[PDB]
Structures are given as C-alpha cells and as structure tokens.
Design an enzyme around this catalytic site. Sequence first.
Site, short mmCIF file in Angstrom:
data_model
loop_
_atom_site.label_atom_id
_atom_site.label_comp_id
_atom_site.label_asym_id
_atom_site.label_seq_id
_atom_site.Cartn_x
_atom_site.Cartn_y
_atom_site.Cartn_z
N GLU B 51 0.68 -1.33 0.03
CA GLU B 51 0.27 0.03 0.14
C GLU B 51 1.22 1.10 0.56
OE1 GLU B 51 -0.11 2.07 2.31
OE2 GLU B 51 -1.55 3.29 2.03
N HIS B 52 1.96 1.28 0.78
CA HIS B 52 3.11 2.37 0.92
C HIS B 52 3.14 2.41 -0.81
CE1 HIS B 52 2.43 2.39 5.41
NE2 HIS B 52 2.96 3.13 5.32
N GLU B 125 7.62 4.73 11.09
CA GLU B 125 6.85 5.45 12.04
C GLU B 125 6.82 4.15 12.97
OE1 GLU B 125 3.64 4.85 9.34
OE2 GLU B 125 3.29 3.21 8.48
#
Lengths: 74, 394
Positions: B51-52, B125
Amino acid sequence: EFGNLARIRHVISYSLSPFEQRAFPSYFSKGIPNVLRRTRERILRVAPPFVVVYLIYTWGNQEFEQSKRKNPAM
Amino acid sequence: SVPETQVSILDNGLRVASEQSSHATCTVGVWIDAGSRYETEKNNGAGYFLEHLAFKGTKNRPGNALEKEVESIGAHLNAYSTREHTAYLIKALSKDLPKVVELLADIVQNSSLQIEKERDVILREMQENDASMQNVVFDYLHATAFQGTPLAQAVEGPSENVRRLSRTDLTDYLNRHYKAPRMVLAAAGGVEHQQLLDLAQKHLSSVPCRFTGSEIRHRDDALPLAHVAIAVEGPGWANPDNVTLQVANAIIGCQSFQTFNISYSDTGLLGAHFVCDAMSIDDMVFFLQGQWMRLCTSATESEVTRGKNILRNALVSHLDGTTPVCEDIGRSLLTYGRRIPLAEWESRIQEVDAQMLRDICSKYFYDQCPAVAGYGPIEQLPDYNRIRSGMFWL
C-alpha cells in the site's frame, strides 16, 4: 498493596489458561532429570554431616555397649 | 424509498457492486480478500508495504502521476489494510467515474513498484507506532488470543520483515493475493450501475484459525495510564448470532470502557477495552465482569430495547454518505458474498428478545477462557485465575 509494590519497565509477560494447557506437561519426562539435577547441586552440602552423625551414633552405641561389657579379669 | 445495491460479475470474476444514491459525489473502491491472515511469516509486511508503495507510481502513470491526477480531478485517494481485507477507494465527483475507475485499475494491476523510501517510512513510523497504546493493546489481544496462527501477526509486520523485503516478494504477494474472483469493485452515490459495469468491462477486465485463552502483560510503570483488553471468541462474520451479540454490546456501550465485536472468517474477538489509572484496574475488571454476567442471567426487555434501538441507529446508510456505504458494499461482498439490506438487519434486530440474548451471551461469554492484554502500570491488574473466576458466578 498491588499497584504500588514495585516499578518495572518493558518486561512483557505471556501466559496460558489453565484449561488450555496440559496439567502435568512432561511431569516425569523432565521432573526426574530436574529432581536429580537438584540433588547433585545440594548433596555435598547436605549429606556428610548426617553421615558423621550416623558414625557417631553407632560409635556411641558400640562404645557404650563395649564399655558396659565386663572385663573378663574384672 | 430504498437503494438496490445492484451487483454483477465479470469474466475475471471481479464483482461490480453499486448502490445508486442521489448524493452528488461518489466513493468508488476496490476491495481485495487479502490481509495479514494470508501471509506466511516470511512476507508479514507485504500488504502494508504494498500500500505504501502503491498509490505511488504505475505502468501508465509515472510516479506522482496518479496522485497528481486524482488531485487534478479533485478526488480524495485513500487506502487501508486489515487482517483480512485491503481497500483502495476514491471519493470523487460522480461524473469523474470514468477516471475514478481507470485510476483504480492501474492501482490494482500494472502497478509499478521508492521501495527503499517506503521501507524507511514504515519502519520509522513503527518506531513511533508504539505511541498508539491502544493499537498496541489490540495487536497483542490478537497475538495472545491467536498464538501460533496467522491471525496473531500484525498488519504492519515485525520490523525484521519490513527491512527484509524485496520487489519480487512484493510482486508475489501482488500476483498471488490480487486475483479477480477475490475482488469487488464497489460504488456508492451518484453512479449508474450499467455505466460502472461497462467501465469495469473496459478496464479491470484483465485481473485452522484457533482462539487460545491466554494472557500477555507488558508492564511499563512509567506510563500514566493503563490499557486493558479482555475478549472471548467471537462467533464469526457469517454467524447469525452476531446480531444478538451486537445488542449485548449496546447494553454495555471506570474509563474509556469501549466494547468491540471484531469479526474474521469464522472467528473473532468479542470483548471490552478500558483505560484506567492503575489503582482502579481491578475494580474496573470486577465491574465489567459483573455486567457481562448480568446479561447472561438477568437481562431486561427494557434494556434490550435500549440496545436494539442504539443498534438501529448504527446501521450505515445513504445518509451516512458514499464512503461509509461503499465501504459496507465492499465488506459485504467480500464477507457475506452479498449486500445485506437494512430491512433484513431490522428484521434480525426485531427478532432479538431478552431470552435469546441471555442464551447467546451464556453461549459465548459465560465460562469461556478470555484473552487478556495489558499495557502500562498493570500490577493491580488481576492474574488469570481471578479473571477466569470472574467469568462465572457461584
């Protein structure tokens, strides 16, 4: 009471439900080895005092009996 | 009076579901039956990573080109990944369906895999994802409840895999879990079903889980508040009793005492998450366990009603908007295989009474062994015997 006993950090602790795990996992499987492991780490500290108690007890008894025993000449 | 949720299928097997509404914009999305449950511990972050990387580069569009265009059209591009489903959806003016659909086609196929940077992004993150205590609690309530299964592993994966991932691996996950029969093209709002079906034909036509009663305790006394989640095995996604369980949650509704019914394919977690100062954790737990027990043996039609009504005002609908609805269309076609209308939900709500609610609550909550996940100053959080004994009444 609980909550104010101590301060720990970042120590995760996993566990299982009693009914989900076998009651006696490898009980005699490792129990015997462990019990034996244990006995060898403590037998030299524990046993020789009681061994010399047994020798002193027997000695005393025999000495005592011998002591009482009549000297033929007596 | 009520939308139709007209749904069709195509050569590939991709389904094309839509629910026309008079709102003006639309939320067109692609759902995929692919999550962390389908990963095999060697590619534990492939879906998240994809997705990233996705949404960024493609075959017909270079780099920002898609992102650049969707901005050009004025649409909002979003994506999310769970343990079972992945969604890529665009909120856009209905007239833009033509491009809202072609863009989505690129995102699912012809995508171009930046990998280095996204790795860093995800990793960093994650280094901070620890700040989301609640997510932590909920990703262990998963680890300790589904030990040894692919449902224990998180969506993000362990930093290890994140660092150790390559295009080919990703390519595999992409080429393996992006099959056309496991895909739903869902549209909600101002869309025509025939036009959406023609656009899907033109583009996109090319496409034993087990619960283990257990406990994880992450003690860190420097945190100001403690988060504790206790769950039992949820029925599932398809199980009918889910609805009588939702009413039970509506009856329950210390601090931040939320309640959850997370459902996966024939499994799930049903329980409560609460954050409290350490000193009160035990009292909370006691409180909470008493309540579950209240429903199990002492429900009241009045309260059930309170619960049925709150559930009635939760059902998602055109009023909630396009995205909320699309999202429901995508999940309904992925999980149930059909879109359950709100009238059927109302019928299943009104058939629920107090007797079957306490029967279903005794079926699940009563006596089953829970999964407990605590994080923070959790010394006064009781251990497993006290919680297990609080799971029944003498």
